Amino acid sequence: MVDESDKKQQTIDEQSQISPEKQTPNKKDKKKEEEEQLSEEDAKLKTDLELLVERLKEDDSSLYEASLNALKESIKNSTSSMTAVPKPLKFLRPTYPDLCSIYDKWTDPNLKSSLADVLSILAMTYSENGKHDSLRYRLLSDVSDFEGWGHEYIRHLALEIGEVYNDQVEKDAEDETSSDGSKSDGSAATSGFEFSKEDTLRLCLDIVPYFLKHNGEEDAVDLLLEIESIDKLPQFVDENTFQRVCQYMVACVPLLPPPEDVAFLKTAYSIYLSQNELTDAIALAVRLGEEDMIRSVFDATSDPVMHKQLAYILAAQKTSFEYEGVQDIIGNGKLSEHFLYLAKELNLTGPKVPEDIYKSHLDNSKSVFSSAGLDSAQQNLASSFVNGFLNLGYCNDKLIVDNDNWVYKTKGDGMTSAVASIGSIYQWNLDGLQQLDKYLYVDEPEVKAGALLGIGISASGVHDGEVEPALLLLQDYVTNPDTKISSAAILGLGIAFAGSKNDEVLGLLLPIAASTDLPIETAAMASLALAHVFVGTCNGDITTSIMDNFLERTAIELKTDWVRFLALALGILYMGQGEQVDDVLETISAIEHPMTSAIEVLVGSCAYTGTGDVLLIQDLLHRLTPKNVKGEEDAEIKSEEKKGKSSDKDATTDGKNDDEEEEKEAGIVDELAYAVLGIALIALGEDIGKEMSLRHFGHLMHYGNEHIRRMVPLAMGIVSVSDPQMKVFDTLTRFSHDADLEVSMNSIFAMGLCGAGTNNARLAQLLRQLASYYSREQDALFITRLAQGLLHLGKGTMTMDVFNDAHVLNKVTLASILTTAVGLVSPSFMLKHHQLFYMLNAGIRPKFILALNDEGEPIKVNVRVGQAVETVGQAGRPKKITGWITQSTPVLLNHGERAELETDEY
C-alpha cells in the first residue's frame, strides 16, 4: 500500500495506489501545456489502461478516490474536453472510471446525485466510438476479482435503462430532460444497445427484458429473435434457450395492457417456431388463442413431406390435445385433401381415440359403488342423480339403469334430470344412446326433454370427423316447435361441440337467440348455449346475442330469473378475448338504466383481464356504496336493485380468478386472503349480500387453482353450515375433487357430517348429497380441473357450465342444469405405431424447485412410480419422463401437460 518508488515493477503498482505519476502530474501538465504532447499521450493511453487493470484487485475506497481525484476535475477545468478534440474523446477510456469512483465507491450524497447525470451524457458520446462497449465488457466478463465492480457495473447499464423507461412516463422524451441529458434514439446510442445486449445475454440476464418493456414495442422483441436463434444449439442446448424466453414473458405479465401483451407473445411463439422444437411452438399458439397461429404449426409438419412418415401422426396428436376441440375442427380435412390414409388420421385428431384409451385406464381403476339407497319422495330424486355423479366419464353401469323401476318414480322436473343423469354414465361415449331412446318414444313430454340433455353429455366425446355429430341428432328437435323440447336440444348441442364453432353448429344457432318478446323462463338456454359455444377462441362478440339481451329488457322484468341468467351469458360470451371487449363495454353503456348498470360490471372483468389491478379496486368500491351513502345521512325498484347487487359480487370473483392465474403464482395466496376480508366486511353490513358471496367462494377456488386445498375449504364449510343455502357445499366440492382420494378423504367426512346429522327439510338435504358424490371418482378414475391442463395458465371451456351455476338461489329447474359438469382430463400413455396403451415409467414431484421459471420446469431427479398411473393433480403435477435409460426418446415433451406421451425407440 505504502509508496516504495520505482525499484521494480511490483513497487510501481504500489507507488500509484497513493499517488499516480504516470496518470496524474505528467499527463496533466502535458495536456495543459504543449500540444505536441498530444502525441506522447496517445502512446501512454495503453500504459494507463494496464495500471487500472493491476489495481482493480485493490478495493479500498480511499486509494481510488483520491488517486484519480484531479483527473476528475480535469474533464471541465483544464482539458475542457476540446482543447485537442479527438484526443480527449479517445482519452475518455480511463476518465470514465474516475467518475464512477465517486458515484459508487465513495458515497457523498451531493456528488453521487450530480455525477449520475454526467456519466450518462459521456456514455453516449463514447458509444459512437463503440469503445464504451468494450469498457463495459472488461468488467462484465471480468479480469480481476474485487467486490467493487459487482455493484458498479449495474450503474453503467442503469444509465441506459433510466432514460428509456422515462420516455413512457414523460412525453417530452430525449435529452430535453436533464435527468439523463441523453437522446432517446438516433444512430449513436441505438448501436450501443444492440452491442451491450450481446455481451449481457451471454454472461447475465438482468437487462435484456428491461430494454424490451421500456421500449414497449414488439420491434425490440423481434431483434431478440435474430440473436437467440443463432445461439439455439451450438452455444447451448435447445432447452436453455426456451427457459429464458418464457421467463421474460411470464414475469412481466401484470404490467402489459391488452394490446401490448398479445403483441409480445407473438414474438415468443415465432422464436419457438424457428428453433428445433415445434413442441414449444404449439403450446404458445394456444396461449394466444388465434386461429392463424394454430394452423401454421399443424401445416409445418403436414404439407412438406409427401409420405406418411412420422409427420402426419404428429400433427394429429398435437391438435387432439385441446379438448376445447377448437383445434380439432380446423385441422381436420387437410388429412382428407392429402389422402394417404383417411381412416387413421381422421380418427386420431378426433376425441374418438381418447374414449378408447379411457377403457385401458378404467380396467385398473375398477367399479366401486357408494350411491344412496334412499327412495320415496324427494329422496328418490336425490339418489337417482347421485348415481350419475359417481360414474362420470365412460362407465358401464348398464344394468342398474335397465331396472326402469327407480327411473319411472322420478316426477316433474326430476323426470327430465333423471334421464339427463343417465346420459352422464355414458359421458364421452358412443354407446349408451339406446337407454335414452326407449323413453323418448313413450309417456309425457317430460321424459322426451330429458333424453335430449343426456344426448348432449354423451356426444361430448364423439362429434368430429363426421362420425355421429350431435348436430345430426338434435336438428330435428330444434324444428319441433314445442319450447321444452327445443330448449333442451340447443343446450346439449352447445355442450358437446364445446369451443367448436363449425359452420353447421354455429349457423343453426345464428337466426335464433333472437325471440324474447314472448315471455318464457327457460329461454335463458337461447343465449346460454351460444355463449358456451363461443368461449375457447377469439370472439366476434356476436351481434345476435347483444341485440337480444336489450330486447328482453324492454319486454319484461317480471321474470327476475330470466334476466339474471341473461346477464351472465353475455360475460361468459366475451371469454376468449379482452382487447375487443374494451369496445363493447361502452356500447352496452350507451343505453343507461340502473338495470343495464348490472350488466356492465360483469363485462368489465373480461375486458381488463391480464393487466387488472384497476379492475380490482373498482369491484370493492362497488361493494361498499349501498351502505356508504346511507352512512353520510345518519350523522319496480325491487327487481332492478337485486340484479344490481348480485352482479357485482359475481364480477369481483371472476376478475380475481382470471388475473391470478395468468399473473405471478405467488399472487394466488394473496388474492384468497383479500376475499376473506371482502366476505367478512359483507356479513356484517348487508344481510342479502352475504347469501351471494358464500356460493361464489367455491368457484373462486376452483377457478383460481389454489395451491392449498386442505385447510381452507374445510374451515369455511363449518361456519356456513349454520348459514342458509346448502348450495354452498356443492361449489366447494368442485375445488376439493382434486387428485381423488388425497384432499377428498377429509372432504367426504366433513360434508357428510352436516348432512347426515341434520335433517330438518329434504330440500336442504338434496343439495348436500349431490355435492358429496361429485367429489370422488373411484380409485382415481379421472380429475376435473377448470384449467386446460395443457397450460396451467390455461382456462377450460367445458367447465364453464359449472362456473355459470352459483349465482342464484337453488331451484329444482337448476338441478337439471347441474347434471352437466363436463371437463375431463386424459391419462397419458406412451404411444407406438400399433398404439401401445401402457406407460413405461414416470417421475412425479410434488413441488418444482426451479426458480428460473415461475411455472418451474420438472426437476430431473423426482420420485419414481409405475405404469399406467393417472397424471396426478396438485402435489404431483410436475412430471418428468423416465425412459431415457431404456434408450427411448420423447417426441412430445410433457411437463405434466394433459398431453399423452409419445416415444420413439432406437
Partner: protein, 47 residues
C-alpha cells in the same frame, strides 16, 4: 366557543377528507401502472 363549538369543526374537516382519500389514493397510485410580547408597539397608527 367551548368544546361543542370545537366538535363541529374538527368533524367537518375530517369527513370531507375520509370521503375523498378513500378512493383518491387507490386511483393515483395505480395510474402509472395501467417575541414574547412586551408592548407589541406598532409604528403605523390606527384609529
Amino acid at each position: 366557543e367551548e368544546a361543542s363549538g370545537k366538535e363541529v369543526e374538527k368533524v367537518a374537516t375530517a369527513v370531507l377528507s375520509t370521503t375523498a382519500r378513500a378512493k383518491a389514493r387507490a386511483k393515483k397510485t395505480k395510474k402509472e401502472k395501467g417575541e414574547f410580547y412586551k408592548n407589541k408597539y406598532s409604528s403605523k397608527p390606527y384609529k
